[PDB]
Design a protein around this ligand. Structure first.
Ligand SMILES: Nc1ncnc2c1ncn2[C@@H]1O[C@H](CO)[C@@H](OP(=O)(O)OC[C@H]2O[C@@H](n3ccc(=O)[nH]c3=O)[C@H](O)[C@@H]2OP(=O)(O)O)[C@H]1O
Ligand SMILES: [Cl-]
Ligand SMILES: [Cl-]
Ligand SMILES: [Cl-]
Ligand SMILES: [Cl-]
Length: 520
């Protein structure tokens, strides 16, 4: 019955029920003319049961859906709109997010999509408590206290749409306006990136005119040399530059934590020059993709031991300037590309600071592993609960699986995840599969790869560390009644891909695996 799948304590009828929707560039104006199902696309979900218009009670979470899907890491953010139903609306809160279970327990048709039925007159009379329409609600994410609203497409035409914020109107660089907005949530780190950009140029220029530095420059091989030679020279360059007036604050703090040492700045610069080729250097989105999967970014951001130490514009600018200068020195030694170092390197790395600062500005998601974790390259991954490790052979409709992901200290990236499938019968719901980082829900882009495996990459950069923890939520969809056998699946693990490293003179991603148990 209804009390099997409805949370009455979270269900209610409200007048002028409002919620928020994150909107992409190109749509902030047009969406205010009305909510309408797009002619094509997933129209809200991979799964027909879940097709509808999606909103949330939290405008900062809505903002997290506003970035240009063609350029999800570095692209422009559109805005947030507030959608309001006139009259009375029933919010129907669900205790499960399994459509088959919900259709069974609410005595619905098992052969019509759930969200379609939600907008029928019969459903609304049965479950509306007098309201003009029903909206379903679900918890937004692990690590979040926000709510997700799922609106029937035809009923959603009744919505009135107002502007909450248009990020582009602010006329700021990169994703700055979006991240300043999100920081209001907290207050907290809320730096002025315009000031940091200018301080960084002023410091760069300052350093290039420094006697001992440009003399140090003169000593560079200025040619392809080994990684060892390159790192050695760069450590020396760092020592030299750190003595400079404009980096005085940086020098003081530098001895204070091993994370901030020159060796680490040099390793970073080396790694950057190694992965940025001409095509990549010429494209901010590609640059950010490449930088986002490197290890060691905690050194330049001054993040260690659960805290953000580089928490002023001045010291962030000092750190960014020094790293930029070092990247320029490394490119001839090991890279192969002029101007990337003070432009796209700086714009890309600013975006990643913004991401990690936004995570530290959020409450730390449930830090302890609740099952014994798998430990590798500084990461720790565990099944959230034993049940998450089991694929029930007779499951109906869909199944969700939670995996906790942490890292021991500095921020370490999650490049993607490797999910097992079964030819037809068991597929990844690419809409409901996501990663939540201290409650920030990050959508994924998923594609098939060899061996009945689907690879999903987060839309926005994922980092975990001390104080920044994630939940990987895998949503499987059953696309066939035909039963699943315990020996039918080609892959029996979920893979987690970490930072890029070199093995056998080749770039590979750190890999961690958790194994599923298939049983009745
Ligand atoms: N006039 C319009 N009426 C309706 N939609 C319009 C209109 N104009 C533009 N859109 C966009 O069209 C899509 C469907 O509503 C959404 O964008 P998306 O980029 O596909 O949105 C990307 C994904 O984000 C989800 N998402 C988006 C924002 C939000 O706050 N929460 C959320 O969960 C979407 O449901 C979508 O899921 P699926 O990709 O799984 O379908 C939406 O912003
Ligand atoms: Cl999105
Ligand atoms: Cl989650
Ligand atoms: Cl605005
Ligand atoms: Cl590995």
């Amino acid at each position: 019955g209804a009390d099997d799948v409805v949370d009455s304590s979270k269900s209610f009828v409200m007048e002028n029920f409002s919620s928020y929707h994150g909107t992409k560039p190109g749509y902030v104006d047009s969406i205010q003319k009305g909510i309408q199902k797009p002619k094509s696309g997933t129209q809200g979900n991979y799964d027909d049961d879940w097709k509808g218009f999606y909103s949330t009670d939290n405008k900062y979470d809505a903002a997290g859906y506003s970035v240009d899907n063609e350029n999800p890491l570095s692209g422009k953010a559109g805005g947030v709109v507030k959608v309001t139903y006139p009259g009375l609306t029933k919010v129907l809160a669900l205790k499960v997010d399994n459509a088959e279970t919900i259709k069974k327990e609410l005595g619905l048709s098992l052969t019509e999509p759930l969200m379609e039925q939600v907008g029928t007159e019969e459903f609304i009379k049965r479950f509306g408590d007098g309201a003009s329409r029903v909206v379903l609600s679900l918890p937004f994410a692990e690590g979040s206290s926000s709510v997700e609203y799922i609106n029937n497409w035809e009923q959603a035409k009744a919505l009135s749409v107002e502007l909450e914020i248009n990020f582009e109107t602010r006329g700021k660089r990169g994703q700055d306006a979006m991240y300043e907005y999100m920081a209001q949530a907290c207050a907290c780190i809320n730096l002025d990136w315009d000031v940091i950009r200018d301080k960084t140029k002023t410091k760069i220029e300052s350093l290039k005119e420094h006697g001992p530095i440009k003399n140090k420059m003169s000593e560079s091989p200025n040619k392809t040399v080994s990684e060892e030679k390159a790192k050695q020279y760069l450590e020396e360059f760092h020592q030299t530059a750190l003595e400079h007036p404009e980096l005085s604050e940086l020098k003081t703090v530098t001895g204070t934590n091993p994370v901030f040492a020159g060796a680490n700045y040099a390793a970073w610069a080396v790694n950057v020059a190694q992965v940025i080729d001409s095509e990549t250097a010429d494209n901010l989105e590609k640059t950010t993709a490449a930088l986002s999967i490197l290890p060691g970014i905690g050194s330049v951001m001054g993040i260690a031991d659960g805290a953000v130490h580089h928490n002023t514009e001045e010291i962030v600018a000092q750190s960014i300037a020094l790293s930029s200068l070092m990247v320029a020195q490394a490119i001839p030694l090991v890279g192969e590309l002029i101007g990337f170092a003070a432009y796209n390197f700086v714009e890309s790395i600013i975006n990643l600071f913004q991401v990690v600062h936004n995570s530290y500005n959020r409450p730390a998601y449930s830090p302890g592993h609740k099952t014994q974790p798998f430990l590798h390259d500084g990461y720790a991954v565990s099944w959230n609960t034993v049940e998450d490790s089991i694929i029930r052979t007779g499951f109906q409709g869909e199944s969700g699986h939670d995996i906790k992901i942490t890292a021991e200290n500095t921020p370490l990236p999650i490049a993607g995840v490797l999910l097992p499938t079964i030819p037809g019968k068991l597929d990844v719901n690419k809409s409901k599969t996501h990663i939540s980082v201290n409650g920030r829900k990050i959508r994924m882009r998923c594609r098939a790869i060899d061996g009945d495996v689907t690879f999903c990459r987060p839309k926005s950069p994922v980092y975990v560390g001390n104080g920044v923890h994630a939940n990987l939520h895998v949503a499987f969809h059953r696309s066939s009644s035909e039963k699943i056998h315990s020996n039918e699946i080609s892959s029996d693990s979920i893979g987690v891909l970490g930072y890029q490293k070199t093995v056998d003179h080749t770039k590979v991603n750190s890999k961690l695996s958790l194994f599923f148990e298939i049983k009745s």
